[PDB]
Design a protein around this ligand. Structure first.
Ligand code: UDP
Length: 268
């Protein structure tokens, strides 16, 4: 029998260990009472492509940081270094020499305590783990320690706070309604990704489908007209609608399908 290695290339989310100290995102009751039918925060910067490594948490969080800098009127615009996030996440949990994936909460810890440098200073390279050893080969950009200069510059971009959003459709909508995207993790089934069919609308999984892996994305909107949330994926702009997809309300609100909804902020 060969046990199947759980796929990390293109994925990378590991469910968070719970911490009762986790801050709660508390939407204003006035906002919840008066949710609009449709929110579309899609930003102007195009999707990234995480390629063949398990960096989805860093891709989702890079985008939350890029998005917030726009809204906070911060300049210049840069793509945050995804490998800087991913390398430091694997100092906490996993290992920098393996494509282990990461918990969202640990990517958030990196942003809070270390920050993130611009991707130009620590550029992306998706050389994957060697399939025989399942270790990054020598020279793989993902296993390289960022330079001392990268760590110093990253300090200029720390977040100040982060909180969990309740897995409740009105709380997810209220978050987006006030103009805040959130990152979350979900299970991926062959009914969406099988044969790279990748429909724009993600089908609701059934017990006939197969679990393929754990993914994490930035959510940027919702539409009551079709009862889907809009997700920014990290698989390039030649899939979905320029890299974006629609996730059904019944998918995102299922505790057996999605979890680990987080908002980040940088205050002043
Ligand atoms: O904005 C924040 C700051 C901290 N925490 C929570 O508080 C815990 C400890 O965070 P802190 O930064 O105080 O920990 P330290 O690493 O400095 O001991 C974290 O694990 C989270 O549960 C949080 O949820 N949001």
């Amino acid at each position: 029998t060969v046990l199947k290695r759980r796929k990390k290339s293109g994925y990378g989310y590991i469910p968070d260990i719970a911490d009762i100290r986790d801050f709660s995102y508390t939407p204003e009751k006035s906002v919840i009472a008066a949710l609009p039918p449709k929110v579309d925060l899609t930003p102007p910067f195009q999707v990234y492509d995480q390629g063949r490594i398990g960096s989805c948490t860093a891709n989702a969080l890079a985008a939350a940081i890029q998005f917030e800098r726009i809204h906070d009127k911060q300049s210049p615009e840069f793509i945050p270094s995804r490998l800087f996030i991913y390398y430091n996440e694997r100092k906490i949990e996993g290992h920098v020499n393996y494509d282990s994936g990461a918990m969202i909460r640990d990517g958030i810890k990196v942003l809070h305590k270390l920050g993130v440098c611009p991707e130009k200073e620590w550029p992306y390279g998706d050389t994957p783990a060697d399939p025989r050893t399942e270790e990054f080969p020598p020279g793989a950009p993902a296993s390289k320690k960022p330079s001392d200069q990268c760590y110093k510059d990253a300090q200029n971009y720390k977040i100040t706070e982060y909180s969990r959003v309740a897995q409740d459709i009105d709380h997810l909508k209220a978050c987006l309604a006030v103009g805040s995207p959130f990152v979350f993790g979900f299970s991926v089934y062959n009914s969406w990704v099988g044969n790279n069919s990748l429909p724009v609308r993600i089908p609701l999984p059934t017990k006939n489908d197969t679990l393929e892996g754990g993914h994490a994305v930035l959510c940027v909107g919702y539409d009551d007209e079709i009862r889907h949330f809009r997700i920014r994926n990290s698989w390039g702009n030649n899939v979905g609608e320029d890299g974006y997809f629609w996730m059904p309300y019944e998918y995102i609100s299922n505790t057996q399908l999605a979890d680990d909804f987080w908002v980040i902020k940088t205050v002043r």
